Design a protein around this motif. Structure first.
Motif, mmCIF file in Angstrom:
data_model
loop_
_atom_site.group_PDB
_atom_site.id
_atom_site.type_symbol
_atom_site.label_atom_id
_atom_site.label_comp_id
_atom_site.label_asym_id
_atom_site.label_seq_id
_atom_site.Cartn_x
_atom_site.Cartn_y
_atom_site.Cartn_z
ATOM 1 N N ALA A 152 9.373 0.178 9.735
ATOM 2 C CA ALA A 152 10.740 0.311 10.230
ATOM 3 C C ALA A 152 10.830 1.325 11.363
ATOM 4 C CB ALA A 152 11.672 0.706 9.086
ATOM 5 N N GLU A 153 10.119 2.449 11.234
ATOM 6 C CA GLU A 153 10.087 3.459 12.289
ATOM 7 C C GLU A 153 9.477 2.911 13.574
ATOM 8 O OE1 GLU A 153 7.943 6.159 9.883
ATOM 9 O OE2 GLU A 153 9.614 7.558 9.634
ATOM 10 N N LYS A 213 11.902 0.396 15.147
ATOM 11 C CA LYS A 213 12.993 1.074 15.841
ATOM 12 C C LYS A 213 12.510 1.653 17.163
ATOM 13 C CE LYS A 213 14.034 5.314 15.392
ATOM 14 N NZ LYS A 213 13.736 6.564 16.145
ATOM 15 N N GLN A 232 12.069 -0.975 19.710
ATOM 16 C CA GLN A 232 13.287 -1.729 19.976
ATOM 17 C C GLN A 232 13.925 -1.276 21.284
ATOM 18 O OE1 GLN A 232 16.672 -1.338 17.275
ATOM 19 N NE2 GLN A 232 16.633 -3.547 16.879
#
Lengths: 19, 58, 277, 226
Positions: free
Chosen positions: C56-57, C60, C63
């Motif tokens: 997830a890190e 992100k 992104q």
RNA sequence: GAAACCAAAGUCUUUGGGUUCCGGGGGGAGUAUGGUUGCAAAGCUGAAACUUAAAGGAAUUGACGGAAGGGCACCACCAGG
RNA sequence: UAACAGGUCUGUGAUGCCCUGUCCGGGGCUGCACGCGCGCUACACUGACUGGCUCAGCG
RNA sequence: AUGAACGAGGAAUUCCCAGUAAGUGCGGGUCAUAAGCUUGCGUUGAUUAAGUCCCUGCCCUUUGUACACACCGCCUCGCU
């Protein structure tokens, strides 16, 4: 801070030729 | 008397956080520049934005 | 451990010899510095990460970038999953999974071009060990057989967070394509027998009863396949002893053998019908 | 929940100072998570109540879902004709949404509530951990959550921060006007990722012997030595 | 005897019963080199350049955020009004 | 005899220091968006209205 | 003459063990006139308990053993 007598610290074991 | 009460309760919160930190490391992984010396309050600064204080979580 | 120094990362990227059309398999993506640098420097970056929160890190951090679509994240343990095709591999690896993973990189198909690996100093020096060195082990001889290795640059641990126990090092590895015509299961089994006790002679290494049991099994398999009649007074240990004296490795010890001696020993044992599988 | 019956809900809608201040921390909370401009995001409203913060979110173009346990809050929110959707439930049992759902989370004065044990079956730490884990579940990966509170002591703060850092959230808290009293707000922002001779003269002082007076010229180079 | 302590660690500046091994500030370093023993693992012998102002032994100690044992109080608690 | 930590009294030290308001009229004395706390009234049927009956004490 | 809110009130807690809480009225002080503060007085008269340090506050004894400070280890890269 100086630890007291109740604190467990073990004494270290000491082990050319001239021509 | 109330000023000392404020100081001690702020110190209690800070020390409670600083004692929260070691078990947070073990089991798992503030507005000083905004003080007003003349009286209690909050004065704007030009170099920095509107007053705040960030204490990141571990 | 999270690698934070940008210039050592740049050195890894530069000496990895990247290409714009390469596919990069990354193990241990960290916080996302070298991941986004590879995304800027490669066509496809395959980052393998077990922990979903690290995924997830990374997702992100990549992104909002034009290189977001070039990243593929493999969630799971890298040891059990099937690795896809890649041109170049880079890895920040923990110690505990260091050795079999390299063998997986030795056994991955199809062949890749290069892999840059972070290792502990103990593992890195055992990886490049020459015969006669005290750090010679099974990893040394197997990796010098199946591949070519180079110890590149000694890395300080202030570049990581948290700084690890032992010092860090960089290893450049590439498999020999085509590999030498040696059965790797056979080679690894023979070396596993000989390195039970590395300072003990091969004669006493082959006097072991477990060795006699496994070689009895394999010799029985060979006699069953080729219809060889076993005499009643047969002794497998006597056979092994006289072949080992016939080869000249009876008085040699396993810590002082190079690749060629093990090749000769395996050739003799396979010519005599003794297999290790 | 039994505070907010029809009477207290009628009080809540008829309070100018309360509406103004809820709008103020709603604006500050929406500013505090860095959602992109001109991108209408999907948000989770916690402590929506009458939907004042939800009304502010609908004013800025964002879409939101409110979660509450009092029926009169949701009834007066419907009576106020809000644009978002409402859900009647407690955060302590878990937010019932799929992973990768909410682009952002805004909680307004709803997190100091779970810090005390009120029933025998209830447990504040486990309820807070379930709440934070469910927040980490229903939020999309890479989102942000802002959680507003008025801590009455630091026990609530330490419990909330431990349960937040144990469920996988990373971040911190920011205090608006820490030195003030009327404007002090707590916003837990989380996301899913010469000296030598001085010492010697002091040593001679502790040994109790006579020493020269300590003055300006104590450690001073007299001249170059060749 | 520096002290912990020792009927020896005494009979020692009031300094000599006989004899053996062995230390000479801290590191470099049990390293390099040579010799020698060992099938091997290793064992015995063993530096210098250089670098440093210390290294080390023994004992007595105030304050010290705190920590633990108890006691009291409906301006504390349980059950309640 | 004694005693003044209760003191009083137009006296003595060119005694040490710091400086060079009265009456009159009117208004206001929480005026109120509020947060911060004590009180009274009730939120009904163990009740409200009306009428009758019948008991105190400190002051 | 009118009957606004008010439907037993979500999370700080206030007081309390017998003629006590609570209901209920009556006096003193302040006062050319308030009714609102404080003191008491009488009438009807309850539930729970004879317990505890779980919290808070106070008073003791021991300790500087626990955490922290301290020990030691681990403690930035890239050309000439």
């Amino acid at each position: 801070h100086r630890p007291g007598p109740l604190k467990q610290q073990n004494k270290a074991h000491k082990g050319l030729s001239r021509v | 008397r109330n000023k000392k009460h404020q100081k001690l309760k702020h110190q209690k919160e800070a020390e409670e956080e600083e004692l929260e930190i070691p078990p947070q490391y073990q089991a798992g992984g503030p507005g000083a520049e905004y003080k007003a010396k003349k009286a209690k309050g909050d004065v704007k600064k030009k170099g920095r934005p509107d007053p705040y204080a960030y204490i990141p979580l571990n | 451990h999270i690698l934070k120094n940008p210039l050592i990362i740049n050195s890894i990227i530069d000496k990895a010899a990247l290409r714009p059309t390469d596919v990069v398999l990354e193990v241990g993506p960290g916080t996302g510095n070298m991941t986004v640098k590879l995304l800027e420097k490669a066509k496809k970056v395959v980052a393998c990460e077990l922990d979903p929160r690290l995924v997830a890190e990374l997702h992100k951090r990549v992104q909002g970038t034009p290189v977001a679509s070039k990243l593929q994240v493999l969630v799971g343990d890298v040891l059990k999953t099937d690795l896809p095709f890649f041109d170049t591999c880079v890895a920040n690896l923990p110690y505990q999974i260091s050795s079999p993973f390299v063998f997986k990189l030795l056994l991955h198909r199809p062949f890749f071009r290069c892999a840059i690996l972070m290792f502990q100093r103990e593992f890195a020096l055992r990886l490049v060990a020459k015969p006669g060195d005290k750090l010679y082990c099974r990893l040394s001889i197997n990796t010098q057989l199946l591949a070519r290795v180079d110890h590149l640059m000694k890395v300080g641990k202030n570049n990581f967070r948290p700084p690890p126990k032992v010092e860090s090092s960089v290893v450049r590895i590439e498999p020999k394509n085509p590999p030498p015509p040696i059965n790797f299961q056979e080679w690894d089994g023979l070396v596993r027998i000989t390195f039970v006790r590395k300072n003990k002679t091969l004669s006493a290494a082959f006097k072991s009863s477990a060795v006699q049991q496994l070689l009895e099994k394999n010799y029985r398999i060979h006699c069953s396949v080729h219809n060889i009649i076993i005499p009643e007074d047969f002794s497998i240990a006597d056979k092994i002893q006289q072949i080992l004296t016939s080869t000249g490795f009876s008085d040699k010890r396993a810590r002082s053998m190079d690749i060629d001696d093990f090749i000769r020993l395996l050739h003799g044992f396979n010519a005599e019908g003794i297999h290790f599988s | 929940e039994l505070f907010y019956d029809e009477t207290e809900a009628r009080k809540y809608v008829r309070n100018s100072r309360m509406i103004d201040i809820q709008t103020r921390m709603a604006g500050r909370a929406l500013e505090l998570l860095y959602l992109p401009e001109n991108k209408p995001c999907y948000l989770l409203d916690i402590g929506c109540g009458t939907g004042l913060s939800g009304s502010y979110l609908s004013d800025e173009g964002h879409y939101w879902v409110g979660l509450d346990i009092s029926p009169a809050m949701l009834d007066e929110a419907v009576d106020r004709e809000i644009e978002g959707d409402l859900l009647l439930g407690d955060m302590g049992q878990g937010i019932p949404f799929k992973p990768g759902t909410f682009d952002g989370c805004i909680s307004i004065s709803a997190v100091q509530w779970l810090c005390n044990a009120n029933k025998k079956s209830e447990n504040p730490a486990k309820r807070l951990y379930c709440f934070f884990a469910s927040l980490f579940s229903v939020l999309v990966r890479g989102s942000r959550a802002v959680l507003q509170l008025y801590p009455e002591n630091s026990e609530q703060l330490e419990l909330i921060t431990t349960q937040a850092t144990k469920a996988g959230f990373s971040g911190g808290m920011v205090v608006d006007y820490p030195n003030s009293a009327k404007a002090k707000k707590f916003y837990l922002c989380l996301f899913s990722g010469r000296a030598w001779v001085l010492e010697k003269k002091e040593r001679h002082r502790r040994q109790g012997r006579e020493v020269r007076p300590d003055t300006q010229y104590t450690g001073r180079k007299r001249k170059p030595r060749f």
